[PDB]
Design a binder for this molecule. Structure first.
Ligand SMILES: [Zn+2]
Ligand SMILES: [Zn+2]
Ligand SMILES: [Zn+2]
Lengths: 89, 70, 48, 1158
C-alpha cells in the first residue's frame, strides 16, 4: 500500500502530535496494519505547526484522529524512526 | 538508501574498505564498552585501574581506532 | 452435614467443593485427607 | 524446560549515584543505581546508618543518569537515559515512594551505540534544558522548562550532531537566569582517519566548547572554545553567580586547569602527591572522584587523586579570575568508585571494591594533616605539595556498607552449623580484598536466644514507659530470668515479677504495676519484686490471662475469670465480678482499649469446650461473656486482638475459629494452618497483628485490617510460634523451637575474611576440605615487589639528615589500601598469594607466595593423577602477567605436596610451560589446557610426563566440565565445545561443535549432555546436545543484564527444586528453577502477559529487551516480573487478576508457592 517515492522527513520526532484523516483511519502509519495500535505518532516539526494544522500525516484529508504506531512496528521499535508526515518531492 | 541512514553510523557499500569497516567496528566496540556498565566494570576491575582512567583510555582508543589507518 | 440433614451453622467448604460446617470441616480434616464429595484432593482443608 | 528464574541476592555494586532534594523537601535523597535497580535513601543523616527510602527496578541499564531540579522546584526530578531511546524524566514523589514520569522523551533505537544519544546526560543549573549526547556525532538538548503547574514544559531537542566530534566530558555550566550553556570536551576524530600516517591523529587535541543556548532565540551555538593539548579525562565545573566563578577545572596528570569562559586565568592547580609516595610516577594524580560541597556562599571541592586521598580545595578567585584552589589532603580516603558530599553530615563514597562509605562531617572540611597545594602556590614544575596520608580529621565515615561487588570467586556449602548454607564470595582488589561468607536463617542478621526454655518470656518491664525490654521475664516454674532485648538476651534476677513460682504471664499492663498471672493469682508487680498477689477465681493456678490496659481477666479451670481491675494507684486488684466459661480456659487475650474507653471492649478466653468466651472488661459490664467464638476443635489458646477486632480460639487440631471481638457475638469462622497445640497471642510482624497457630508447620493468622489469613513462614523448622522484637529487626516472627528461634521477616550473617591479593580462584582441598584459595592481583605491584620498591626508595632517599628518616618511614609505611589507596603500578607485575582458610575459620592456615610478576591463574588442590589419593595441588602462575596487550612470560604449574593434609601449602616442585595453563583437571591422567594446547600429563609432584597433547583448539580453554569420556570446554569464540576425551584411547575428538559464537565465562553440567555458559555480554545460555562438526542446541537462553561470573546447576536452597545458582560480578545471585509443571508455567506466562501490560518498565526498554538484549530469550520465566506483579498496586492487581482470570490472593499464593519451591 506504499510507494517508492514520497519520503516524509526522516527528522527526529518532537512534541508536534500526528493526526489522521478519515480516508485512511485506523491503519498503521508505517505498515498500514490494524493490530494493537500502541504508540502515538509525533511529527517532529511544523508538519503540525502552522499551515498543516489538524491535517492528515498520510494522503492529505482533514485530520480528525490521533495517528498511532502499531505494536508490530514497535516490536522492532520503528516508532523512534522520526516524522511520518508526507512531504511531497 | 536514505540520507539520514548514510549519516547514521553503520553506512557501508561495496566500495567501503575492510580496514575502514574494522576501524568503525573498533570505534563502535569502544563506544559500546563505554556505554555498558558491566563491561566497563569488568574492564576496570581486571587491573588496578580507575574509572576515569578507563574512560580516558576509551576516549584515546576511539581516536586510536582511526589511529593508524591505511 | 448433607447426609445427616441437620442444622447448618458456621458454614465452611473444603477443597473438594463439599459444603459443611466449620466443626464438620475440622472433623473431616482430622479424619481423612479426602472429603466426602467424590474423595477428591481436599488435603484436610479445615478453612472458612 | 521453562526456567522460573528469581534473583535471590540483589547486585551490591552501584553502577551510578545521584543526590539532591529528590525527596521533594530538605531531606537530601541520594539514589545509588546498581544497574537495573536503584535504591534511594532520604533518611536522617544524624542516625549514622544508611536507610533507603525507596527502591525501583527499571528492567534496563541507564547509559547516563542524573537528578536535577527546576527553577523553584523543591523536588529534584531524575532523568535517566537508558539503552533504549526513551529517556525518562520523572519527578520523585516520596509519599508514594516512587518516581512519577513527567516525560519519556523518545530519542532512538535501543542500546548505547556510537551514534545513540544519551551516553552523557546533564542538565542546566536553572533546570531549563537537558543535554544527552552519544559517544560521537550525536548530541541533543531538550528544552524542558517549568509549566504553570510546575510540570515538565518539554520541547523538541536542538541537535548538535557535529561530525567525528568525540565528547570526553560534558557539563552544563551555571549561567543563572540568563541563557544557559554546556561545555563539552570535543575532539575532532575525522583528522585521525584523514591522516593515513597518523600525524593528525597524534596532533589532535581536545577543546572545551562551551555552547550557549539562547532560549529566546531557541537556538544553541558554540559560544566559547578553549582548546587544551592534554586530553580531558574528567572535568569539574565551578558554580557561577554567588556560588563562585563560572569556570571549570579540567583534570590531568597532577594538573587541574581551572578556567572560565571569558577573561579568566587558567589556574593549573597541582594535585598534591604523597610525601615519599611508594607508587611509581607513571600513575599521574587525576581527579577520579570530585564533589563540590557548597555552603550558603562559597564551595569547597573534595577530590580524589590516583592514590585517591580526599583533598579539600578552597577558592581564592576573588570574583575576577581563577587564582588559588587550596587543595589540601583533608583526609585519607579508601578505594572508592565515586564520592558525593552533601550537607548536614552527608558524604556518600561509593566503593568499587570493599565497603561504600557514608560519612558525617565533624570539622569544617579544611582539617588537613597533610600539605596544601594551591593553584596560586608556586612550585618547580616537577612535583606538588607533599601531602602524605593524613588522619580523617575533617569527617568520619559513620557507615561502611560492605558490597559483594566485584564478586570474583564463590563457594557455597552447608559445612558450617547454620540455618542456611554459608556462601563465601571472594571479592575485592589487592590488600582491599576479602571473602564474605553469608549464612541466612530467614533473616539471620543477628543471633540471640532467650534464657533457657522457660514457661513464658514476656516483657515484665520497670513500668509502661520502658519501651525497650530491659527485663523480659523468661520465667519458668523453677525460677525466673531477666533478658535484655538488644540481641544480648541472657538470664538475670532483675525481672521483678516474682517468678520463683510458675509465672504464666508477666507484662507491664499498668502504668507501673506489671500484671503477673501466677499460681498465687493476679500480682501487681513493680519495677522491683514487690508483687501484691491477689487471688484469682478459685484456688487453682492462673491458666489463662486476658490482660488489658485496665482489667486483666485471670481465668482458672472451669473458665472462672477474676477481673484484676486497675485501682487509682495503677495496681491490679481482684474485683468480686467473675464469670465462668463452658470449660477450663487454656489461654486468653484482651483486645486493646480505645482512648476514650475505660477498659477493653473484648477479652476472650479459650475454654476446653470448643469456644472462646469474650466479655467486656469495663467495670459496668464486667463478668458478662457475650461474644462466643466457638472453636471447631478443642481450643488450646485464644487471641483477641485488634484488626472490628478478631477473637480467635486456636486448637490442638488443624482449625482455629475467629469471630468479631465486640459486645455483639460474631461468626466463628474456622481457618486452617503440625499436630501441636496452638499458642495464639499478640505478635508483631511488619506492623500487623497476628495469632500464632503453634505447630511444626508454624502458621500465623495475620489479622491485618480486620481480615485473618493463616499461612506458614519461610524460616527454619520449630514447634511453637511467637513474635520477635530485638536489635536486629523491629518486628518479626520467631518460630520458637526447643531453645531455638527461627527468624522470619514477616538477611544473612556475612563475615569477610581478608586476602593478600585480588581474589582469583577459590578451591577446596581434598583432604582438608578447607578453602585453599588463590588471589591474583595482576597488572599491579606485588607484595614482594612493593617491599622491594620500599627498600629501594629507602636506599634512594637515605642519601642526604631527616630525609633518611623519611626514607625509612616510606619503607615501613606507604599509602595503605584501606587508608589512602594501594601504591601499586606496573604491567607485567602480578601478586599471587595462595591462602588456605580453614573449613570453619576464615583465617588462612597456610600461605604460599609466587613471583612478583606471576599471577595465580587457577587453584586446584585435589588428589594427584600420577600419585594416589593424597592431595597434591596444581597451582598455575603466569609470569610477567600483563593484560593489555598480550604479554606473559610463561605458566609455571607448581605441584605442591600440600602438607598437614592440605593445611600447609608445601610446594614440591614445578613444571614450566610457555603458555598459560588456566585449566588443570584430572581426566581418567590430568588434562592441562595451556591455551589452545591441552595435554594429558601425569600429575606428579616433581615433573609431569605428557602422553597426548592436542593443539586443535581455536583460541583457549576457559573451562571444561567432564561427564565421563566427554569434556565440554568454553572458549573465547565458542561458548561450549564437547570433545570425547578418550583417555583409554589416549585421544580427544570433538564429538560436538559450536554454532553460537559466545565468550562464555562459566560452565555448569545440568545433565550428561547439558552445558551452561555465561557469555561476556551477560547472557546465560543452557545448551543440550542433540540425541545420538555438529552443534548443541541452545535449549534455554536469557540475558541477565550483567556479566555472570559463575553458574552451577544445583539445588542452592535447602531442599526445594534442583535449580541453577548463578553468581554475577555485580554482587547478584540468582536461582533459575526448571519448572516441570506446565499448568503453573502457563499460569506464570499469563501472569507475565498481564504484568507486561499493567506495569511498564521505567527505562524504556522492556523486560523482553532486558532478557534478550544480546541473544534472544528462550525457556525462561521471569520471576522478577512475577515479584513486580505482586508488588503492583491494588486496582492494578485486581485488573491483572481479571486478565489472568484468577484472584490476586490466588496469584500471591502461587507466587509464594513458587518461592517455597526454591
Ligand atoms: Zn505498523
Ligand atoms: Zn489520510
Ligand atoms: Zn516532519
Amino acid at each position: 500500500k506504499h510507494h517508492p517515492d514520497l519520503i516524509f522527513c526522516r527528522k527526529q520526532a518532537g512534541v508536534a502530535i500526528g493526526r489522521l484523516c478519515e480516508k485512511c483511519d485506523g491503519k498503521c502509519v508505517i505498515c498500514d496494519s490494524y493490530v494493537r495500535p500502541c504508540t502515538l505518532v509525533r511529527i517532529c516539526d511544523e508538519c503540525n505547526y502552522g499551515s498543516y494544522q489538524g491535517r492528515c500525516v498520510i494522503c492529505g484529508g482533514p485530520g480528525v484522529s490521533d495517528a498511532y504506531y502499531c505494536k508490530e512496528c514497535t516490536i522492532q521499535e520503528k516508532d523512534r524512526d522520526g516524522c511520518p508526515k508526507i512531504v511531497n518531492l | 538508501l536514505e540520507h539520514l541512514q548514510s549519516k547514521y553510523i553503520g553506512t557501508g557499500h561495496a566500495d567501503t574498505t575492510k580496514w575502514e569497516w574494522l576501524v568503525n567496528q573498533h570505534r563502535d566496540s569502544y563506544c559500546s564498552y563505554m556505554g555498558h556498565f558491566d563491561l566497563l566494570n569488568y574492564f576496570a576491575i581486571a587491573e588496578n585501574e580507575s574509572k576515569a582512567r578507563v574512560r580516558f583510555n576509551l576516549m584515546e582508543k576511539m581516536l586510536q581506532p582511526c589511529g593508524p589507518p591505511a | 452435614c448433607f447426609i445427616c440433614r441437620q442444622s447448618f451453622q458456621n458454614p465452611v467448604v473444603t477443597k473438594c467443593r463439599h459444603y459443611f460446617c466449620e466443626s464438620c470441616a475440622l472433623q473431616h480434616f482430622r479424619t481423612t485427607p479426602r472429603c466426602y464429595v467424590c474423595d477428591q484432593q481436599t488435603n484436610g482443608v479445615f478453612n472458612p | 524446560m521453562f526456567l522460573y528464574n528469581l534473583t535471590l541476592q540483589r547486585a551490591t555494586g552501584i553502577s551510578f549515584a545521584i543526590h539532591g532534594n529528590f525527596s521533594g523537601t530538605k531531606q537530601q535523597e541520594i539514589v545509588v543505581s546498581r544497574g537495573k535497580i536503584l535504591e534511594l535513601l532520604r533518611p536522617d543523616p544524624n542516625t549514622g546508618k544508611v536507610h533507603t527510602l525507596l527502591t525501583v527496578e527499571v528492567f534496563g541499564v541507564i547509559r547516563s543518569l542524573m537528578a536535577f531540579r527546576l527553577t523553584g522546584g523543591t523536588k529534584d526530578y531524575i532523568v535517566v537515559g537508558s539503552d533504549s531511546g526513551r529517556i525518562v524524566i520523572l519527578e520523585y514523589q516520596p509519599s508514594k515512594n516512587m518516581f512519577e514520569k513527567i516525560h519519556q522523551e523518545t530519542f532512538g533505537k535501543s542500546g548505547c551505540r556510537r551514534i545513540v544519544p544519551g551516553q552523557f546526560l546533564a542538565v542546566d543549573p536553572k533546570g531549563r534544558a537537558v543535554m544527552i549526547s552519544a559517544i560521537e556525532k550525536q548530541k541533543l538538548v531538550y528544552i524542558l522548562n517549568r509549566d504553570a503547574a510546575a510540570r515538565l514544559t518539554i520541547s523538541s531537542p536542538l541537535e548538535a550532531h557535529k561530525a567525528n566530534t568525540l565528547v570526553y566530558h560534558v557539563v552544563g555550566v551555571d549561567v543563572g537566569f540568563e541563557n544557559p550553556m554546556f561545555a563539552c570536551l570535543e575532539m575532532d576524530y575525522e583528522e585521525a582517519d584523514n591522516d593515513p600516517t597518523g600525524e593528525a591523529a597524534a596532533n589532535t587535541q581536545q577543546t572545551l566548547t562551551f555552547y550557549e543556548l539562547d532560549l529566546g532565540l531557541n537556538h544553541v551555538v558554540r559560544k566559547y572554545s578553549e582548546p587544551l593539548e592534554e586530553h580531558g579525562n574528567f572535568l569539574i565545573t565551578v558554580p557561577g553567580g554567588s556560588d563562585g566563578p563560572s569556570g571549570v577545572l579540567i583534570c590531568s596528570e597532577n594538573y587541574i586547569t581551572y578556567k572560565n569562559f571569558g577573561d579568566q586565568p587558567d589556574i593549573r592547580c597541582p594535585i598534591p602527591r604523597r610525601r615519599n609516595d611508594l607508587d611509581d610516577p607513571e600513575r599521574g594524580m587525576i581527579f577520579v572522584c570530585s564533589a563540590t560541597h557548597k555552603t550558603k556562599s562559597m564551595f569547597f571541592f573534595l577530590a580524589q587523586t590516583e592514590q585517591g586521598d580526599i583533598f579539600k580545595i578552597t577558592l581564592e578567585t576573588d570574583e575576577d579570575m581563577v587564582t588559588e584552589i587550596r587543595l589540601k589532603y583533608f583526609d585519607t580516603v579508601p578505594v572508592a568508585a565515586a564520592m558525593c558530599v552533601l550537607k548536614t553530615g552527608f558524604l556518600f563514597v561509593a566503593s568499587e571494591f570493599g565497603n561504600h562509605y557514608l560519612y558525617q562531617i565533624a570539622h569544617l572540611g579544611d582539617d588537613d594533616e597533610e600539605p596544601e597545594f594551591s593553584s596560586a602556590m608556586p612550585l618547580e614544575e616537577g612535583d606538588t605539595f607533599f601531602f602524605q596520608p593524613r588522619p580523617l580529621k575533617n569527617l568520619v565515615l559513620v557507615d561502611e556498607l560492605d558490597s559483594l561487588s566485584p564478586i570474583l570467586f564463590c563457594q557455597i556449602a552447608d559445612l558450617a552449623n547454620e540455618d542456611t548454607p554459608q556462601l563465601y564470595v571472594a571479592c575485592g582488589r589487592g590488600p582491599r580484598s576479602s571473602l564474605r561468607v553469608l549464612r541466612h536463617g530467614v533473616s539471620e542478621m543477628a543471633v540471640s536466644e532467650l534464657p533457657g526454655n522457660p514457661n513464658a518470656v514476656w516483657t515484665v518491664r520497670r513500668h509502661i514507659e520502658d519501651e525497650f525490654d530491659a527485663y523480659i521475664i523468661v520465667s519458668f516454674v523453677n525460677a525466673t530470668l531477666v533478658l535484655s532485648i538488644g540481641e544480648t538476651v541472657e538470664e538475670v534476677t532483675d525481672s521483678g515479677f516474682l517468678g520463683t513460682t510458675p509465672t504464666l504471664s508477666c507484662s507491664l499492663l499498668g502504668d507501673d504495676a506489671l500484671v503477673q498471672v501466677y499460681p498465687d493469682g493476679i500480682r501487681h508487680i513493680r519495677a522491683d519484686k514487690r508483687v501484691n498477689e491477689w487471688k484469682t477465681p478459685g484456688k487453682k493456678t492462673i491458666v489463662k490471662c486476658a490482660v488489658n490496659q485496665r482489667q486483666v481477666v485471670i481465668a482458672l479451670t472451669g473458665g472462672e475469670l477474676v477481673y484484676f481491675e486497675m485501682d487509682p494507684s495503677g495496681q491490679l486488684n481482684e474485683y468480686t465480678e467473675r464469670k465462668e466459661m463452658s470449660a477450663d480456659v487454656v489461654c486468653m487475650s484482651l483486645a486493646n482499649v480505645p482512648p476514650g474507653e475505660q477498659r477493653s471492649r473484648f477479652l476472650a478466653v479459650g475454654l476446653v469446650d470448643n469456644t472462646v468466651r469474650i466479655i467486656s472488661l469495663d467495670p459496668s459490664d464486667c463478668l458478662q461473656p457475650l461474644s462466643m467464638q466457638a472453636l471447631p476443635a478443642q481450643p488450646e489458646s485464644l487471641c483477641i486482638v485488634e484488626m472490628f477486632l478478631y477473637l480467635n480460639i486456636g486448637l490442638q487440631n488443624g482449625v482455629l475459629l475467629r469471630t468479631v471481638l465486640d459486645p455483639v457475638t460474631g461468626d466463628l469462622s474456622d481457618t486452617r494452618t503440625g499436630s501441636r497445640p496452638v499458642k495464639l497471642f499478640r505478635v508483631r510482624m511488619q506492623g500487623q497483628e497476628a495469632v500464632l497457630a503453634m505447630s511444626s508447620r508454624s502458621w500465623l493468622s495475620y489479622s491485618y485490617q480486620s481480615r485473618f489469613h493463616l499461612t506458614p513462614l519461610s524460616y527454619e523448622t520449630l514447634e511453637f510460634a511467637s513474635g520477635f522484637a530485638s536489635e536486629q529487626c523491629p518486628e518479626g516472627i520467631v518460630a520458637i523451637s526447643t531453645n531455638t528461634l527461627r527468624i522470619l521477616a514477616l538477611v544473612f550473617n556475612q563475615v569477610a575474611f581478608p586476602l593478600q591479593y585480588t581474589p582469583r580462584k577459590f578451591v577446596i582441598h581434598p583432604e582438608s576440605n578447607n578453602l585453599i584459595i588463590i588471589e591474583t592481583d595482576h597488572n599491579a605491584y606485588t607484595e614482594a615487589t612493593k617491599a622491594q620498591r620500599k627498600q629501594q626508595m629507602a636506599e634512594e632517599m637515605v642519601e642526604a639528615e631527616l630525609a633518611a628518616e623519611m626514607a625509612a618511614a616510606f619503607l615501613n609505611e606507604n599509602l595503605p589500601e584501606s587508608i589512602f589507596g594501594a601504591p601499586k603500578a606496573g604491567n607485567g607485575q602480578w601478586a599471587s598469594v595462595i591462602r588456605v582458610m580453614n573449613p570453619i575459620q576464615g583465617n588462612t592456615l597456610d600461605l604460599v607466595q609466587l613471583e612478583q610478576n606471576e599471577a595465580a591463574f587457577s587453584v586446584a588442590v585435589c588428589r594427584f593423577s600420577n600419585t594416589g589419593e593424597d592431595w597434591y595441588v596444581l597451582v598455575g602462575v603466569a609470569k610477567d602477567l600483563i593484560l593489555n596487550p598480550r604479554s606473559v612470560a610463561g605458566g609455571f604449574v607448581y605441584t605442591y605436596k600440600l602438607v598437614n593434609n592440605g593445611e600447609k601449602l608445601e610446594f614440591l616442585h614445578k613444571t614450566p610451560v610457555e603458555e598459560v595453563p588456566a585449566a588443570i583437571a584430572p581426566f581418567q591422567r590430568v588434562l592441562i589446557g595451556v591455551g589452545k594446547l591441552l595435554r594429558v600429563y601425569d600429575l606428579g609432584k616433581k615433573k609431569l610426563l605428557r602422553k597426548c597433547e592436542n593443539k586443535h583448539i581455536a583460541n583457549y580453554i576457559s573451562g571444561i566440565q567432564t561427564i565421563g569420556h566427554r569434556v565440554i570446554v568454553s572458549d573465547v569464540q565458542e561458548s561450549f565445545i564437547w570433545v570425547r576425551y578418550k583417555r583409554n584411547e589416549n585421544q580427544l575428538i570433538i564429538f560436538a561443535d559450536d554454532t553460537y559464537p559466545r565468550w562464555v565465562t562459566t560452565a555448569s553440567l545440568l545433565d550428561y549432555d547439558t552445558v551452561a555458559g555465561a557469555d561476556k555480554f551477560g547472557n546465560i545460555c543452557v545448551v543440550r546436545l542433540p540425541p545420538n562438526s555438529q552443534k548443541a542446541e541452545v535449549i534455554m537462553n536469557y540475558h541477565v543484564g550483567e556479566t555472570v561470573l559463575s553458574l552451577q546447576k544445583t539445588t542452592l536452597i535447602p531442599g526445594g527444586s534442583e535449580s541453577l545458582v548463578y553468581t554475577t560480578l555485580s554482587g547478584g545471585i540468582g536461582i533459575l528453577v526448571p519448572f516441570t509443571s506446565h499448568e503453573d508455567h502457563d499460569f506464570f506466562q499469563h501472569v507475565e502477559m498481564h504484568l507486561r501490560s499493567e506495569h511498564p518498565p521505567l527505562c524504556g526498554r522492556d523486560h523482553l529487551s532486558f532478557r534478550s538484549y544480546y541473544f534472544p530469550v528462550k525457556n525462561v520465566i521471569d520471576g522478577d516480573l512475577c515479584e513486580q506483579f505482586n508488588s503492583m498496586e491494588p486496582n492494578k492487581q485486581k485488573n491483572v487478576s481479571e486478565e489472568l482470570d484468577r484472584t490476586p490472593p490466588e496469584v500471591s499464593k502461587k507466587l509464594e508457592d513458587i518461592r517455597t519451591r526454591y
